[PDB]
Design a binder for this molecule. Structure first.
Ligand SMILES: [N+]
Ligand SMILES: [N+]
Lengths: 872, 872
């Protein structure tokens, strides 16, 4: 086929084939920007590599070399030529942008002979050898996997040995020396093989390494964390080199057209004079803030700021750009819509609509919904913060209030978090390998690196606090301790970070619940204008109901009732009913619960003010309510006038092999209708009274759990209806109410047209539906789920993301068949999936009426629903 | 002239003549609404009364009686007739709405003979006598000033005597009795005069009482508090009566089409069955929430909700309505745009724009700017609130976190606040007489009264916390104590109120700084779109600068520098310079201050990020920096090797008769240029360095205080320029800077064209300009300002509201003449007036470029500036 495209042959629309970096390089070429020429090996070439038993096919290599020849002709130089070489950069990039995770190798082409021709042609040996030891290092890292450590230790040995204080203070003589030590490393690691001297072998080795890396364990995991399918592959961009390490009038930088942490309009970012990209990211030399370049090189700044505004206007969004200045001449290497925190996304989308650059629909569609969870992260209690002990400060790389126990390796931090600890990862700097520990941390603190350092950008991405470049810190990896200010810290010691101010605190500073911007309220107003799904919340108390309404919830899709039986002042009533031996004594025990539960329901209807609430009837088996402690069993035997033995025999009788599928929910209402009769009286008495007290109308929604058969639901509904009508008569009420069901048993969805004959609404309990569709319990699934992710068997966690392919089939069928028998059938979802964007999009598309999520996920659901409406 | 108009003869545009209540009665008549017919005696009639030595002229009375005759013909009944009387309500209302402050007398016309004809015609004696004792009471209160106390004590004696528990449980027999006791009261107070029996005398007495009341001390003060001019007068509305006290199918209510505390859309308010308005406001019978009327009288509710939506749609804003149901027939008595809290105003204006009912310009224009100070009131620290001891709860009448020492009379609460205490007024209920104590309170707590009670509505108006109708409270006026829950409270004891939840706490619950809505950020976006003035802030520290920017400030209009000399680590430098005897030793002492001050300025430029800052040079006389304590004087003598006597002699030498007009500001820079030279070096060194460190450009603004003459400013500017240019040369800087002046001496404004020859900008220091224009010091003016307000000599405090008539003349002239010599002259204001709406409007109109206010007043200035732009 055709596996390679020149930049001139592509555009932004070819993203899936060229990857985002390649399509953006193409697009800037199309605009006539000062972009060094190059080409792209497509994402399809990556699939082909994978379909050929992980090998580059003859045809592909032929086409790579062909394009290389095309590059040579344009430049007038032969690739890696012994005399006047042409050198290239090789950079990977998939359809989806993955900041901090891809690969870059500069100066490819250099070798023992080309480096001398390079030195002669540039007239600058120090620059030639600096470029060579860089390339030897980047290639050893990227292609093989020799740790910078091996190289950084040597470069530091030499500088320290030579008294010099900076990489820049090395002579062309030291650099030739350094390169040889560097090559020794690669060989001292390649089982005796020498660093490839043929330019063509270097190119293929780098290309193969890019395809190979797509399947590294860290890429696999990062892709699951960001919902990126693996089949997308990655492309490889190859470009002619421009050098920011040629001298004092050369440099390299990374900047954003607006701030990615706050969203404020205006250039943000950093650069270094006489450097290559690597240097800026590392922060050994303190990177200078982008705005300062105006002082050093006014003309190049002017040009850069003009092109930067031109790029934001062309792409119609904040841009993350990389540039290189080679001896006074400005080049752009990359541009992409910049990753950003949620506050920054709202601010920015809002400013772009106000400047007339985009429409409200465009603003809504572009914000990453999952990221709005950041808006509800607790912020520090101001009093506590002022009272707090500042021990140091640095760059506010990524916003947020982080407080946790310190760990010094991504693996320890993750292991600690898993045991339930809030963790803070402290490192010299982070790397793609630290990703899982980073994701586990409340915050991230580093010794070197600025706003565009690895920790900074990956953290903004995750919406995680990060203070970076705190040079005052002294880490003792080995001992697992670090010193800052007044004292040494030890693994586990609490410290706090303010990602907004850069301040670092001793101890665990108190945090409180956050509030909300106006760009947030503004974005929600536009969202509402477009969404058609309604958004309800999963709430069991007045307090959560209020929080949820405050975030936009229009009512409740799931009000669990177990706590109304489990609570200290409730538990003995139900225990007494369970240990009874008469339907009469069961009812009498149950009846004592009425006043309590009626009371909990009046409080909820009082906080609802007319908003609907779906009340789920008793869900768990009886064993969950009986004491499992010989001691509590003894106490109960004593309160009921029974022997410890009797109580124990009843407990043993209720025991089940698989509690997930035993005698519970609807099946329990069938054997003991008394339970449902009681919850009905509590519900209807509470509603009727609150309606009498306020005049605010109520239409109770009573939902029966774990139904699989029409006549099973009918049996329970009859019981409920009989009590509801009786309560209505006793109170002189004409209140209306609906009786519906959960669709959480596969059979219910398969026979939903029959179920709809009795059910007035459907709530999709997808947590349970997923367990029964996949055949596994969430609580026992961690002993293999992780092996499944690692082996790519699953690319997403089915409990956090609706499985559209399988489980989705049952949700779609249930709505379709339910509506064959009851056209106006109302359908909601209340499993954890209702707060997940892709799931919410699936529900909008299959016709649900509303989704229901935890209070603090309401904003996410509201935005995701608007997006589903616009994207469909 | 023509002093009386029928409702049919008026409309909303005639507001200034008919008053807001009369024009709204007219407008609803025009709409064909079920409004009882009546007429309005104009505001002009009130001015006429005042121009005739406080007396109703023959012509006016003639016209009142004429209209009364017109009323009779329509009704078929003669006013106060012995047989079938026509009775009327008399209600006052000025061009401006003043909720809780005006007068209402129902049932006027009743007398010893008319009440029997009334009883016979209605066939309902209990209703006739209930109406009579009501009228006797309302007339005694309103016309004369007999305290309800006298009447409430008797009504309670009788009910208590007769065992009955409610006003409603009185027999027609008890009521005839009650009325006679009531008449006895009025006589037992009118030096033996009997309650007027002639209907016409009652009408004139009520009309005169309304005109008379316009000048009561409480109306005068309330008008100053709400910026209402007195010359506006008040109109009197006279209307045929409809009765909500006729029986069980009669009632009366007050409702708002949207909630006035939160702004949420939907009916809000209360009513009572078998009652007159008075009853609802008092809360002896617990008022029922408006929504409940749907349960009692569905058809009348339907009609009411339809007319209510029709009124909001006609007026295009949330309406505060009053209605009466007479034996099943709905009447509307009043409608007005409802008063509301700031959050409610933003929410509502925002919803109205989204529903397409109003434009963004209309939203902006209608919100009361001064009320946005409410948005920045501290809210409770959530942790502290949960930790708090709830001792009771009631209606959340007006939002806010109030915490203070309790007082039981409006006068004590005010006196206590004046001594600097945070106060909480606890009363059975409030009255117009409590207004000044209410205004002094952090919060208001009452025993009876609902959402439309006096405290509720006046408090919403003031934006003050209020929890009302807490019946569990027991007040012991005499002892100045009250019991609630766990204990008795005593005058001064701290309690806290949550006006949002209605909860009441023991102690002083901790509060923290508030945040901001999205309807607030939304309203500001629309505001910015319209305003042309810029808004800067008065800020001296990094912290206040940040708060201010966060609220929208575009820079700093006044950065005072006194603290840079006054601070513990600064004071000894300046004291040493003052006690010196050589220009050389003065400079050397001054120089030691440079590092400190340069440091304070770098911190400010660091927080400014390029935003301009106007730096005011040293303002106070030297006496302010020398010790005034023989003890500190001794310590200084010791540190300087001087005798206590010498130090004391220098202190005595610096003493002045009038420090406000002595040797200070510019005159001090003239005698000691060393001081200005030093502040210039601190300023320019700090700016240049921060510009080198960030690349972010800075244009320092140096403002010389208390200038009266062109050559005086030139002398100082030369000094400053010489040092600025020197610092520029030493640092290799080409930074630009402007030297301006305060316009705070009348002479500076009178000769501003000359001053503009040297000043690059003008900042209007209106605090001082007002003192020198009025000739009084703010700090000594309280011993007569209050007598001036009481005597109406001044209607506004000149220190809080720019005096447009006089002081405004100098500000206008200064800008006009300054621009004759320097057309692009930049002009700002930074006196306290820059945060006051009417002042901000005056500044927009006279051409200023920006206003500058304290950080927390920034929102007020931003909105007021948009409003000035639209209204002009
Ligand atoms: N379930
Ligand atoms: N002043």
């Amino acid at each position: 086929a055709k596996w390679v495209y020149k930049f001139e042959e592509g555009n932004a629309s070819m993203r899936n084939l060229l990857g985002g970096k390649g399509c953006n390089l193409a697009e800037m070429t199309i605009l006539g920007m000062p972009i060094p020429q190059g080409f792209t090996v497509t994402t399809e070439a990556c699939t082909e590599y994978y379909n050929s038993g992980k090998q580059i096919t003859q045809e592909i290599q032929d086409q790579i070399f062909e394009a290389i020849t095309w590059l040579e002709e344009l430049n007038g130089k032969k690739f890696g030529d012994t005399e006047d070489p042409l050198l290239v950069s090789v950079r990977s990039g998939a359809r989806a942008s993955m900041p901090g995770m891809m690969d870059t190798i500069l100066n490819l082409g250099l070798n023992d002979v080309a480096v001398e021709g390079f030195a002669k042609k540039t007239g600058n040996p120090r620059f030639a050898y600096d470029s060579y030891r860089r390339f030897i290092q980047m290639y050893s890292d990227v292609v093989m996997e020799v740790p910078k450590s091996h190289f950084e230790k040597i470069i530091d040995a030499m500088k320290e040995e030579k008294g010099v204080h900076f990489d820049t203070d090395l002579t062309a003589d030291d650099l030739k020396e350094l390169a040889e030590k560097f090559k020794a490393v690669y060989k001292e690691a390649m089982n005796g093989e020498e660093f490839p001297q043929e330019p063509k072998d270097q190119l293929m080795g780098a290309v193969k390494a890019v395809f190979r890396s797509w399947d590294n364990p860290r890429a696999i995991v990062y892709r699951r964390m960001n919902d990126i399918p693996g089949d997308w592959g990655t492309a490889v961009n190859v470009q002619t080199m421009v050098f920011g390490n040629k001298g004092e009038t050369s440099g390299t930088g990374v900047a954003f057209t607006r701030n990615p942490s706050t969203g404020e309009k205006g250039i943000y970012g950093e650069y270094l004079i006489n450097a290559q990209g690597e240097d800026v990211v590392a922060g050994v030399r303190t990177p200078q803030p982008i705005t300062q370049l105006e002082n050093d090189m006014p003309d190049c700044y002017k040009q850069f700021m003009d092109l930067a505004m031109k790029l934001e206007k062309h792409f119609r969004d904040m841009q993350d750009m990389e540039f290189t200045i080679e001896e006074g001449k400005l080049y752009f290497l990359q541009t992409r819509n910049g990753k950003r925190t949620a506050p920054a996304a709202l601010q920015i989308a809002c400013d772009l609509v106000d400047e007339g650059m985009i429409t409200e629909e465009e603003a809504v569609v572009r914000i990453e919904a999952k990221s709005l969870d950041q808006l509800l992260h607790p912020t520090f209690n101001p009093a506590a913060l002022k009272a707090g002990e500042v021990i140091g400060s640095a760059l506010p790389a990524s916003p947020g209030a982080a407080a946790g126990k310190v760990y010094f390796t991504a693996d320890e931090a993750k292991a600690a978090h898993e045991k339930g600890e809030r963790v803070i990862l402290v490192r010299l700097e982070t790397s793609p390998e630290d990703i899982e520990g980073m994701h586990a941390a409340e915050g991230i603190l580093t010794v070197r690196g600025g706003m565009t350092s690895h920790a900074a950008v990956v953290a903004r991405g995750m919406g995680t606090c990060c203070v970076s470049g705190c040079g005052e810190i002294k880490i003792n990896e080995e001992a697992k301790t670090f010193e800052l200010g007044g004292h040494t810290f030890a693994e586990g010691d609490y410290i706090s970070l303010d990602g907004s101010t850069g301040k670092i605190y001793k101890g665990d500073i108190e945090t409180q619940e956050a509030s909300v911007s106006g760009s947030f309220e503004r974005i929600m107003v536009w969202a509402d204008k477009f969404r058609t799904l309604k958004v309800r919340t999963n709430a069991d108390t007045p307090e959560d109901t209020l929080n949820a309404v405050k975030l936009g919830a229009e009512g409740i899709g799931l009000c669990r009732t177990e706590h109304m039986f489990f609570e200290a002042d409730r538990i003995m009533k139900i225990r007494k009913m369970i240990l009874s031996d008469s339907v009469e004594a069961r009812e009498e025990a149950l009846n004592e619960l009425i006043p309590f539960q009626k009371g909990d329901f009046k409080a909820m209807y009082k906080a609802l003010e007319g908003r609907p609430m779906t009340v789920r009837y008793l869900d768990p088996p009886l064993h969950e309510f009986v004491p499992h402690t010989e001691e509590e069993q003894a106490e109960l035997a004593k309160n009921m006038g029974l022997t410890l033995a009797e109580v124990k025999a009843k407990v043993d009788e209720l025991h089940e092999f698989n509690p997930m599928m035993g005698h519970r929910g609807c099946r329990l209402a069938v054997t003991y209708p008394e339970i449902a009769k009681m919850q009905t009286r509590a519900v209807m008495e509470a509603a009727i009274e609150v309606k009498e007290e306020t005049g605010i109308d109520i239409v109770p929604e009573i939902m029966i759990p774990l139904v699989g058969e029409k006549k099973e639901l009918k049996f329970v509904k009859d019981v409920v209806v009989e009590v509801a009508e009786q309560v209505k008569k006793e109170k002189g009420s004409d209140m209306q109410y609906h009786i519906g069901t959960m669709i959480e048993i596969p059979r219910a969805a398969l026979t939903a047209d029959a179920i709809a004959e009795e059910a007035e609404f459907f709530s999709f309990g997808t947590n349970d539906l997923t367990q029964m569709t996949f055949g596994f319990s969430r609580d026992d699934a961690g002993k293999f789920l992780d092996s499944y992710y690692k082996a790519k068997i699953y690319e997403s966690d089915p409990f956090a993301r609706l499985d559209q392919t399988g489980v989705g089939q049952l949700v779609e069928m249930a709505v379709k068949k339910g509506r064959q028998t009851r056209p106006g059938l109302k359908c909601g979802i209340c499993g954890e999936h209702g707060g997940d964007p892709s799931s919410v999009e699936f529900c909008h598309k299959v016709g649900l009426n509303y989704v229901s999520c935890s209070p603090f996920r309401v904003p996410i659901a509201r935005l995701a629903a608007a997006q589903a409406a616009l994207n469909n």
